[PDB]
Coordinates of C-alpha atoms in Angstrom, one line a residue:
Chain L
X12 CA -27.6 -21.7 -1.9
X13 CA -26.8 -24.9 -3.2
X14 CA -25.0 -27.7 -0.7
X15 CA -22.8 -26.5 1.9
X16 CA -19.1 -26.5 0.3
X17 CA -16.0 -27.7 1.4
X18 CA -13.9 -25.3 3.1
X19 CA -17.2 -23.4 4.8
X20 CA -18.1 -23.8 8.0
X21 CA -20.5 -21.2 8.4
X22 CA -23.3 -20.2 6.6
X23 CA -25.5 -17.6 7.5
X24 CA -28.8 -16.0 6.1
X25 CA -30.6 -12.5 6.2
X26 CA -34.1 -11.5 6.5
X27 CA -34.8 -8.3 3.7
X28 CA -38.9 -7.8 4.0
X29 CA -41.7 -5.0 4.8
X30 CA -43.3 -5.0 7.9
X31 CA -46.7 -3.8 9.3
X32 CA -45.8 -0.9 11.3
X33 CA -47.5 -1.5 15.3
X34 CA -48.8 -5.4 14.0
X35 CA -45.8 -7.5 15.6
X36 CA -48.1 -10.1 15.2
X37 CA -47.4 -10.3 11.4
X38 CA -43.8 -8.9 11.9
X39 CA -42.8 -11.5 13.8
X40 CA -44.8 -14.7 12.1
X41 CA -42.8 -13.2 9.2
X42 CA -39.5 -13.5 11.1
X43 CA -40.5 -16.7 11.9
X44 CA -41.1 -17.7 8.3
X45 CA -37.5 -16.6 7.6
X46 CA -36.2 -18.5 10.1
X47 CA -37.7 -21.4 9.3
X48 CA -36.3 -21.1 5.5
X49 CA -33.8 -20.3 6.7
X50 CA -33.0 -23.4 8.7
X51 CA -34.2 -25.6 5.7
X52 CA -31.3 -24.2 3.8
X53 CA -28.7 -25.3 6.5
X54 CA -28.1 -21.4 7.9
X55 CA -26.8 -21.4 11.5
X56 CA -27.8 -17.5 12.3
X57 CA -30.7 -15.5 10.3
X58 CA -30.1 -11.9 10.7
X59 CA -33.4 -8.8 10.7
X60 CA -33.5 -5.9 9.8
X61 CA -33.9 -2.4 12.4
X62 CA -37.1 -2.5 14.8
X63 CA -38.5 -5.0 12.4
X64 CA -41.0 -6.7 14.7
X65 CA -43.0 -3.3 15.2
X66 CA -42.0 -1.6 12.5
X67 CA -39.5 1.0 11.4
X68 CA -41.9 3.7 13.4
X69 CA -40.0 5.7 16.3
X70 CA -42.3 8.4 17.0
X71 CA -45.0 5.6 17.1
X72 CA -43.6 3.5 18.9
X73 CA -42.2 6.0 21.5
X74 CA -45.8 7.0 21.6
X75 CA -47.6 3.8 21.8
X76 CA -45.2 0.6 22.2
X77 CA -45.3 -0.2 26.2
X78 CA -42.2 -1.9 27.6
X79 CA -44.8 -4.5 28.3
X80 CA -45.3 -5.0 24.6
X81 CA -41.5 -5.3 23.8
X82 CA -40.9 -8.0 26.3
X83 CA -43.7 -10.2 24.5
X84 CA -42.4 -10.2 21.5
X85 CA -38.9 -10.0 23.0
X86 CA -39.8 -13.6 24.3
X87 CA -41.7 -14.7 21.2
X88 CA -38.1 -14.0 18.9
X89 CA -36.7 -16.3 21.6
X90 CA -39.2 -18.8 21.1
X91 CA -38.9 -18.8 17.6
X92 CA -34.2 -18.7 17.8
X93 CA -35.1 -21.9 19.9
X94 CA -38.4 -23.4 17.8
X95 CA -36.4 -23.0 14.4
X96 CA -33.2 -24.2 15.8
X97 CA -31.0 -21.3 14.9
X98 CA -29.4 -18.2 16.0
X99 CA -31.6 -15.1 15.5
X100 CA -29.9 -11.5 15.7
X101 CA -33.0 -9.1 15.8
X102 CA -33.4 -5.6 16.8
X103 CA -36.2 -3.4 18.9
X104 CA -36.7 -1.3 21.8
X105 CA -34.8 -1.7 24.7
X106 CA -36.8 -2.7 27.7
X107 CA -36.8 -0.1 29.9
X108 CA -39.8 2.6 30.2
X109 CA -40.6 4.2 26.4
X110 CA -38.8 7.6 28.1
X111 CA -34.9 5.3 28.8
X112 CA -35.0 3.1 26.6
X113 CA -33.0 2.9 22.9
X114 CA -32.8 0.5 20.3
X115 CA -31.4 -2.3 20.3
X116 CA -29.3 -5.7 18.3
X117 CA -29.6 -8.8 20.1
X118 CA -28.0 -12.1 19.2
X119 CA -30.0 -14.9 20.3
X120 CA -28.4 -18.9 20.1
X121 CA -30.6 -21.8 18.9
X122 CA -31.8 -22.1 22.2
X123 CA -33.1 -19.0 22.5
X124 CA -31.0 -17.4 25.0
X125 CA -29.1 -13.8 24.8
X126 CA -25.7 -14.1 23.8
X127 CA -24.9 -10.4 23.0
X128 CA -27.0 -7.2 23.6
X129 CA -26.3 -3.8 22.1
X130 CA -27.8 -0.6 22.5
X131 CA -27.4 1.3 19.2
X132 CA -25.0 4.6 20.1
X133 CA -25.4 6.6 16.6
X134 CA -29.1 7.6 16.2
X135 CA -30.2 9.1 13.0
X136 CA -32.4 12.2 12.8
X137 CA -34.8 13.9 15.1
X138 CA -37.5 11.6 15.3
X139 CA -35.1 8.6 16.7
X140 CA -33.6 10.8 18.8
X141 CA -36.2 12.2 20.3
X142 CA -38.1 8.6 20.7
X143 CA -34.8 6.2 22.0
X144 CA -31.8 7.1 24.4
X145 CA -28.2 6.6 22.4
X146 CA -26.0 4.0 23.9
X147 CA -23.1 4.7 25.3
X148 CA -20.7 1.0 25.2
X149 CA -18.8 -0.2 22.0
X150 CA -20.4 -2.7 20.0
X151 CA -19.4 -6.3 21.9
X152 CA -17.5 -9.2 20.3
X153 CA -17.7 -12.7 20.4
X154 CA -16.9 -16.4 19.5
X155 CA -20.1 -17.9 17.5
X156 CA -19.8 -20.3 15.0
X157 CA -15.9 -20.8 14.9
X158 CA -15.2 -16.8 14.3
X159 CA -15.5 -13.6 16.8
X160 CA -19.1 -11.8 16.0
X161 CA -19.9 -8.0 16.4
X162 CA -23.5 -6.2 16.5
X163 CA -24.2 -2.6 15.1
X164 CA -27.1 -0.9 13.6
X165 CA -27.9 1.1 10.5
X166 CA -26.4 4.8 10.8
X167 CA -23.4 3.2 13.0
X168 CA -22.1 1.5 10.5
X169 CA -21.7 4.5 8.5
X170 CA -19.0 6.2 10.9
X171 CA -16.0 4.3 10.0
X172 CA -15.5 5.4 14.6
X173 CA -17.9 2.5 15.0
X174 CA -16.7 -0.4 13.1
X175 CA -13.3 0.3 13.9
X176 CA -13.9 0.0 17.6
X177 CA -15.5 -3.4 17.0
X178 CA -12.7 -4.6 14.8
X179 CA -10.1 -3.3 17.5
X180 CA -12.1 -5.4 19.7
X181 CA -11.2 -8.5 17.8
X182 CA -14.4 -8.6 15.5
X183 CA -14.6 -10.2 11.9
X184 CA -17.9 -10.5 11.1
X185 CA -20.2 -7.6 12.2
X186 CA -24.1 -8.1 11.8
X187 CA -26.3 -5.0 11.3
X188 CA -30.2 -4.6 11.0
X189 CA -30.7 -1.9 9.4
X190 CA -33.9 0.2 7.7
X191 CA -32.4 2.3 5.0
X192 CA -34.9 4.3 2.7
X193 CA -34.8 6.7 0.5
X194 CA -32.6 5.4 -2.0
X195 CA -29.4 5.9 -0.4
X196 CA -27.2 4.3 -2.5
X197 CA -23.8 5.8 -1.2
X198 CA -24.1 3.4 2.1
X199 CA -24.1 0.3 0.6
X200 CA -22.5 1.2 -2.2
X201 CA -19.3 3.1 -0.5
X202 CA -19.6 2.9 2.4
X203 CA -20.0 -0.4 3.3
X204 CA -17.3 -1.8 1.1
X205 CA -15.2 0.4 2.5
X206 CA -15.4 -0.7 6.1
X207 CA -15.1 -4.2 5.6
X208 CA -11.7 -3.2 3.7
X209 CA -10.4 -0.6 6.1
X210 CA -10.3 -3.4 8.9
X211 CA -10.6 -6.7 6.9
X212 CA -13.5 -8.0 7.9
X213 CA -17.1 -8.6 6.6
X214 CA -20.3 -7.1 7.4
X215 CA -23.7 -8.1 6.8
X216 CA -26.7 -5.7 6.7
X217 CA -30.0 -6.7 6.7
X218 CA -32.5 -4.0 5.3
X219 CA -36.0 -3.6 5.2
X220 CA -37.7 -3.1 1.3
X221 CA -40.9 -1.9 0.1
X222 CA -43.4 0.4 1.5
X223 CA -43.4 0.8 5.3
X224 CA -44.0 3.8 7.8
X225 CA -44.1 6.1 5.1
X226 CA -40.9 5.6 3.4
X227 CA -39.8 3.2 0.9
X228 CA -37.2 1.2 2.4
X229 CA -34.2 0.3 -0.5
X230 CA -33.8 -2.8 0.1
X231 CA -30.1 -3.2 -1.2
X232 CA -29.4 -6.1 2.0
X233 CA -25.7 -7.6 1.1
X234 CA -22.8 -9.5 3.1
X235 CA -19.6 -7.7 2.3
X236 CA -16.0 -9.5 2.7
X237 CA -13.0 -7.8 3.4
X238 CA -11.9 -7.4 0.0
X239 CA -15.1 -5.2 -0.2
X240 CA -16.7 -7.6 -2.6
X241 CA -20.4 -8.5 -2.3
X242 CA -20.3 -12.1 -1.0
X243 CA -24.7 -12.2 -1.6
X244 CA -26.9 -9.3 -2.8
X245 CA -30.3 -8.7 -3.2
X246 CA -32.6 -6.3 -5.3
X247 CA -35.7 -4.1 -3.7
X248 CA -38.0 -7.2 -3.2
X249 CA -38.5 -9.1 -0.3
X250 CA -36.2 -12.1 -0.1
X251 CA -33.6 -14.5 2.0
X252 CA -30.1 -14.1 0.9
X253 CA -27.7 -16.6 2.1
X254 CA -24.7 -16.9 2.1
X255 CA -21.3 -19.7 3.0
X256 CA -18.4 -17.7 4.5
X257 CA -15.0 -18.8 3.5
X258 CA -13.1 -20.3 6.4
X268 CA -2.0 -3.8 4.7
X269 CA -2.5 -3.9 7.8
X270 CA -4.7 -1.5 9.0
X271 CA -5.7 -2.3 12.3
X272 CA -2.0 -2.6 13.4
X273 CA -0.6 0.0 11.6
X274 CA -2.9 2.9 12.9
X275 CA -1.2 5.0 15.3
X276 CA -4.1 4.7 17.7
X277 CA -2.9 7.0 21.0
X278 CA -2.7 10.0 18.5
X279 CA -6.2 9.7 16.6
X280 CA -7.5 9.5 19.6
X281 CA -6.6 13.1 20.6
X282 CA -7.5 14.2 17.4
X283 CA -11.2 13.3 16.5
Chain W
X12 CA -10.5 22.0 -19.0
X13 CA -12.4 24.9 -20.8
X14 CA -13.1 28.6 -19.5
X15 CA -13.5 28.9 -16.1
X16 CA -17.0 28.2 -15.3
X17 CA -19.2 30.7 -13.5
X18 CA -19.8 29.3 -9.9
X19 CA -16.5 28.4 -9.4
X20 CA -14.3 30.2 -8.3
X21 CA -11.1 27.5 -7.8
X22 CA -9.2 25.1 -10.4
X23 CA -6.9 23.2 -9.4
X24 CA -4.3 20.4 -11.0
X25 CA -2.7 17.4 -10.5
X26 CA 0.5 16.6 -12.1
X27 CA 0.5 12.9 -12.8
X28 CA 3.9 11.5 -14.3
X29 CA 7.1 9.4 -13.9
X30 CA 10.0 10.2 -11.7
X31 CA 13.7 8.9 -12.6
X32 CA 15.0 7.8 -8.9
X33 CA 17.6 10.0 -7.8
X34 CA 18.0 12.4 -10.2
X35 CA 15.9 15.4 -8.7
X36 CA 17.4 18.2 -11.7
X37 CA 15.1 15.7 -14.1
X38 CA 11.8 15.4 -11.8
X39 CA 12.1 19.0 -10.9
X40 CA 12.3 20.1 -14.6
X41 CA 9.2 18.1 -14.6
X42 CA 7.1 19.3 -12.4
X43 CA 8.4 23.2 -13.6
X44 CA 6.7 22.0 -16.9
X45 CA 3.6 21.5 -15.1
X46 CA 3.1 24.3 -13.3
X47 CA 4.0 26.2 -16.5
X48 CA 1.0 23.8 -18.1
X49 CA -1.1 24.0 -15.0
X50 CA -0.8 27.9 -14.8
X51 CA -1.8 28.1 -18.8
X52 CA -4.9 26.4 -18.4
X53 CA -5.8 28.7 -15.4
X54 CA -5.3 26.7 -12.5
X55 CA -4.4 28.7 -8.7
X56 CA -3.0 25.2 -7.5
X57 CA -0.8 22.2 -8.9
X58 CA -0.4 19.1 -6.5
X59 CA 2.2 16.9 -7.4
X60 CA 2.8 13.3 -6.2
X61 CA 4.8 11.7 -2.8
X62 CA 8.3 11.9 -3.1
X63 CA 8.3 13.5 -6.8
X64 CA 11.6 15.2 -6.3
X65 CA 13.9 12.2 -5.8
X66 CA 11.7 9.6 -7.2
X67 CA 9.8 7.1 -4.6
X68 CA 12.9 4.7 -3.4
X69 CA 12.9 5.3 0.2
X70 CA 15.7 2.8 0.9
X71 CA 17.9 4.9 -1.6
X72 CA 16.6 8.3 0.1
X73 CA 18.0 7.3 3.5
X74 CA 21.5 6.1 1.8
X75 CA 22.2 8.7 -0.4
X76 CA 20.5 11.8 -0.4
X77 CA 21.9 14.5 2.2
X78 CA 19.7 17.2 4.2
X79 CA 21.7 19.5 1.8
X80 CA 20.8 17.9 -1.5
X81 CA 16.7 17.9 -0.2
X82 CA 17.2 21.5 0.8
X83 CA 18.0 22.6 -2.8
X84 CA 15.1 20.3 -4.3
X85 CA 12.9 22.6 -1.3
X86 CA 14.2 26.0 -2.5
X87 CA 14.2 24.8 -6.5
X88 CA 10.4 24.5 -5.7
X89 CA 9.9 27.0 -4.3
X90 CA 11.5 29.0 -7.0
X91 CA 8.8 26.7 -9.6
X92 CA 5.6 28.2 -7.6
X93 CA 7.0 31.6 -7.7
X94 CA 8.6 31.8 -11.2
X95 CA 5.8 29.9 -12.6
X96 CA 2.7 31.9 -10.4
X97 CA 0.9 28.7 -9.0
X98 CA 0.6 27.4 -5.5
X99 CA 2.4 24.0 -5.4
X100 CA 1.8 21.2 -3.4
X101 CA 5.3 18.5 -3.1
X102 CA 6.4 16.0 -0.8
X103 CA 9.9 15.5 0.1
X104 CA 12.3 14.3 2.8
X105 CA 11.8 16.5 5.6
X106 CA 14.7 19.0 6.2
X107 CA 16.7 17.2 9.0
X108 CA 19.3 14.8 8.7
X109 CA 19.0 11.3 7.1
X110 CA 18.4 9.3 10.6
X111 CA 15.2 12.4 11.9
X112 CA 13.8 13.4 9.3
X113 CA 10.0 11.9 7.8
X114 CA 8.4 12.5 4.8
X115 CA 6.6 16.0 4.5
X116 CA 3.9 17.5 2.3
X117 CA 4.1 21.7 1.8
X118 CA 1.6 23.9 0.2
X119 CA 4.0 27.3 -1.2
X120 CA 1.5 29.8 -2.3
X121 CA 2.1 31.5 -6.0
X122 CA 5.1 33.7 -3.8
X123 CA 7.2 30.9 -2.9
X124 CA 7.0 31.2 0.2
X125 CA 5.1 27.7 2.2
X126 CA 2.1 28.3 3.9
X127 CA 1.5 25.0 5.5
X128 CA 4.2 21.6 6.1
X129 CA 2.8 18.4 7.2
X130 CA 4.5 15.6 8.1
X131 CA 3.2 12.1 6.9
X132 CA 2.2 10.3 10.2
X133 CA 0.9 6.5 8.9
X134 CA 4.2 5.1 7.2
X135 CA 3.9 2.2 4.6
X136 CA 5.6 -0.8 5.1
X137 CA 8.9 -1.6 6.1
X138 CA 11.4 0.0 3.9
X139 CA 9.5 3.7 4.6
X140 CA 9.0 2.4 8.2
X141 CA 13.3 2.3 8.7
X142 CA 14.0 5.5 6.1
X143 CA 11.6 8.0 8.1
X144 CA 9.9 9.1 11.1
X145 CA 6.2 8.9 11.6
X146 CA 5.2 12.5 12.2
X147 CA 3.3 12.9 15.4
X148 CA 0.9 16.3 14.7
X149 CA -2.6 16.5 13.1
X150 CA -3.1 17.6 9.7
X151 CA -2.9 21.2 9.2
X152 CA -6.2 23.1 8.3
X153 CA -5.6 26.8 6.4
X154 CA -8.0 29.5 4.3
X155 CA -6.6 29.2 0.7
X156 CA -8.2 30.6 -2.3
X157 CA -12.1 30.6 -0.2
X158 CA -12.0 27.5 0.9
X159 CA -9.8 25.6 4.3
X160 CA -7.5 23.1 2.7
X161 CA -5.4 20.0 4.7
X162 CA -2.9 17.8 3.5
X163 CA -2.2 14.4 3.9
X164 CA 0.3 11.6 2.3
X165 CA -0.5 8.6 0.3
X166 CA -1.1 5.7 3.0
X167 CA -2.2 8.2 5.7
X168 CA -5.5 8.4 3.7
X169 CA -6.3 4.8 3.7
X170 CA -7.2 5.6 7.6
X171 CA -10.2 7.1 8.4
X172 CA -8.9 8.4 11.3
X173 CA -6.5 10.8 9.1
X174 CA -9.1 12.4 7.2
X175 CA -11.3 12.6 10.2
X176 CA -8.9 14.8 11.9
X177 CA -8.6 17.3 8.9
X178 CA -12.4 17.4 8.5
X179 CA -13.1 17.9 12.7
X180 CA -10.6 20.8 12.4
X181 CA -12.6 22.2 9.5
X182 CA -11.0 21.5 6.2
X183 CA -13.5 21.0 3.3
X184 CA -10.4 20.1 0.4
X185 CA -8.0 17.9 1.5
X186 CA -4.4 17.9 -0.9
X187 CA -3.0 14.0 -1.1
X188 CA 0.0 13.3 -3.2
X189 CA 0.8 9.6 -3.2
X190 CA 2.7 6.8 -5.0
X191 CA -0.2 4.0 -5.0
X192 CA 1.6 0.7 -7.2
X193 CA 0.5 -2.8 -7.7
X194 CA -3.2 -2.3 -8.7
X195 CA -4.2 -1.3 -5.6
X196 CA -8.1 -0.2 -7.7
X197 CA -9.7 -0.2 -3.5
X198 CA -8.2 2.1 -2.4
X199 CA -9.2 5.1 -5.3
X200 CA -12.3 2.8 -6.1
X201 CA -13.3 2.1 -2.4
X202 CA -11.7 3.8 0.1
X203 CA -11.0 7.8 -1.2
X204 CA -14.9 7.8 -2.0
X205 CA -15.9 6.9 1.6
X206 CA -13.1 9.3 3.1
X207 CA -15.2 12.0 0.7
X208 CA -18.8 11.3 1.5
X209 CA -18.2 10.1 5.3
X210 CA -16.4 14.1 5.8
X211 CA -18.4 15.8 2.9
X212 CA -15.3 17.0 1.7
X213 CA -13.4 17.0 -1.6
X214 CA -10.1 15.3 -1.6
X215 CA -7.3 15.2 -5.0
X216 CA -4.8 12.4 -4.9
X217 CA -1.9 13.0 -7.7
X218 CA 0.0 9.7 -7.9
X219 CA 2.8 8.3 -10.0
X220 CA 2.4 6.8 -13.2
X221 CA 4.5 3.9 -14.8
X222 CA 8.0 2.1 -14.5
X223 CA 10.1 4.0 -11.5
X224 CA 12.4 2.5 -8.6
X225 CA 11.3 -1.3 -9.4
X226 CA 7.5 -0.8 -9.1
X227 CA 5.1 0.2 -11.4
X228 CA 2.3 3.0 -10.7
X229 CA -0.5 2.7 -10.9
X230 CA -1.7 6.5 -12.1
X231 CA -5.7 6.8 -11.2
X232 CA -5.0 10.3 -10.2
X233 CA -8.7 11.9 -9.2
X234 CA -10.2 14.4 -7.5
X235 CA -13.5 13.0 -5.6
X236 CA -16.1 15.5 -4.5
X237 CA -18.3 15.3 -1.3
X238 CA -21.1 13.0 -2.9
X239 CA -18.1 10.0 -3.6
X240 CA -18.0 11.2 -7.6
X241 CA -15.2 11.4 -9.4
X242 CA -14.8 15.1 -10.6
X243 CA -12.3 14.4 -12.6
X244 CA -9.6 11.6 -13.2
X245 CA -6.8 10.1 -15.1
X246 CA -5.4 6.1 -16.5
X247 CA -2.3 5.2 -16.5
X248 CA -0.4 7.8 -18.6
X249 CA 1.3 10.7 -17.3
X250 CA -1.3 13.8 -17.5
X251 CA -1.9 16.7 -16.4
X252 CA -5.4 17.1 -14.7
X253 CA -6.9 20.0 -14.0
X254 CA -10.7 20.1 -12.1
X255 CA -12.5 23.0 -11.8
X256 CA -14.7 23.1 -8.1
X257 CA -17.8 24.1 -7.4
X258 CA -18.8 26.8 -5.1
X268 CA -26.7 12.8 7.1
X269 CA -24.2 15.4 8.8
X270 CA -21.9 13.0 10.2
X271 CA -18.6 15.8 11.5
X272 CA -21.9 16.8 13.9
X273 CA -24.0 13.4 15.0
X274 CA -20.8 11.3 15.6
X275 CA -20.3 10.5 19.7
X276 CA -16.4 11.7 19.4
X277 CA -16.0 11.6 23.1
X278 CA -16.6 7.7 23.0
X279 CA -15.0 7.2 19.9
X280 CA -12.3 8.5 21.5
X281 CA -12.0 6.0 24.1
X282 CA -13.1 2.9 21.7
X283 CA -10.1 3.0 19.2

């Protein structure tokens, strides 16, 4: 949006759009449409929303998605990170057998090779957990772009447990696909805000909209800064929100050893 | 606010007002006139803000107020919930000498006698950081008028971690007296609403209002109820508020025994 300012050095850009749920065919030319625009606009990293490239489907794709099938499109998001020139953070099934494998955020560079891969530890409801394995590793940090990078994905974000233990680890922007439906307003709308303010950092979360799978996905995708502001915002349709990051004390203050004893 | 509705079965209040530093005779009278208030209008409970008694000027606590002079605020209140028939909620020094003690909250039931002490484990900054100790247990959990009720102090609340440890031992209403100044609007705009919908629990928060000990407060006093709403709340003038309460499960799906490990 607009030339890149003075006093940004990063700008970054999220994917919000339906998919086709088992056509990762048109999931991912979509992807790569977004990546491409993406790129035109000057963002270094385009961020997808959850399972995007075979839909938001778990029983389905428990049932029918081979880990065959995830590594080729696996290497097709790789092929576009690298064909498009940016970093791609994407999300689908791990890549073990459909019976131990769970989902999964992975931060591709503009070469198209894995920087990050996280296995997402909070599953929501029966039908993800009975179709993926939770994780069990915190959420990994790292230097991208001039600032340390976090993954998550959709329900972790909402446990304040989950941010915080990417934060301790040195986080300050955290990147989460999600697929939110069902007009839950309260995560974006509270809780969101309220983890980027409780550790001072900013999140963005990249949501599916429209009709997909069943549900009707919100939409709602936003970049939140540590003031809990909305940096970027976008409405129910589908769309590429971008956005130029600027260049108490919580996180020090906590009195770690004994919260840990009591959760 | 009205008769007491059917399908509830528990008001409560908030005394929201202006202490005068150091002169406890004056902020006791005080708070006897709004348990006398809080008890017309029907209310079982009155919560009354951090450090009411001597006004909030830790500095000034630590110099000059004595382990004597804070145990006759304690047993004046005491005297308030009986006299007056009304649990009350205060916060004061804690009862040991100047150099051990922290700052506490107590719950006194409509006898006088004090059901539950807790004492304030997250300190704010550094003049409360050299005129207290932290306290070092969990927030206490008890059965009070059909429902279990915690307490917690002003900053603590700002921590996920706090509330979580009320809510994992099973309180549903959790009592906050504070002393919020500077236009702090994220933390009852942003943060109390998450600590509510991220626990599914109610939480009131009775804060100072106006010119006392060289700050300004900034009032907001509210209850928030499990969805993030406000149930009730009050500006910036002293008031008296009084809430009547009616009668994703996150406390369950979160991985506490990695949590645990992550903070």
């Amino acid at each position: 949006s607009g030339l890149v300012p003075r006093g940004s050095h990063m700008r970054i850009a999220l994917m919000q759009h339906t998919a086709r749920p088992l056509d990762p065919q048109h999931n991912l030319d979509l992807i790569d449409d977004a990546a491409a625009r993406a790129s035109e606009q000057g963002a270094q990293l385009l961020l997808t929303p959850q399972l995007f490239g075979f839909g938001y489907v778990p029983s389905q794709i428990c049932a029918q998605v081979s880990a065959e099938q995830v590594d080729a499109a696996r290497s097709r998001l790789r092929g576009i990170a690298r064909d498009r020139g940016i970093a791609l953070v994407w999300s689908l099934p791990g890549p073990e057998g459909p019976e131990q494998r769970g989902i999964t955020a992975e931060l591709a560079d503009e070469h198209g090779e894995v920087l990050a891969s996280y296995q997402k530890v909070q599953l929501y409801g029966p039908e993800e957990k009975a179709a993926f394995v939770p994780g069990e590793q915190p959420p990994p940090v790292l230097s991208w772009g001039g600032r340390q990078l976090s993954l998550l994905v959709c329900y972790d974000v909402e446990f304040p447990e989950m941010v915080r233990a990417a934060a301790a680890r040195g986080a300050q922007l955290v990147l989460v696909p999600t697929a939110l439906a069902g007009d839950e307003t309260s995560v974006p709308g509270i809780l969101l805000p309220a983890r980027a303010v409780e550790n001072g950092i900013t999140l963005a979360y990249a949501n599916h909209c429209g009709p997909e799978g069943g549900l009707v996905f919100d939409g709602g995708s936003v970049v939140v800064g540590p003031a809990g502001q909305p940096l970027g915002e976008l409405g129910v349709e589908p769309g590429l929100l971008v956005v130029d990051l600027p260049d108490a004390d919580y996180l020090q203050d906590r009195r770690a050893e004994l919260h840990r004893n009591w959760l």
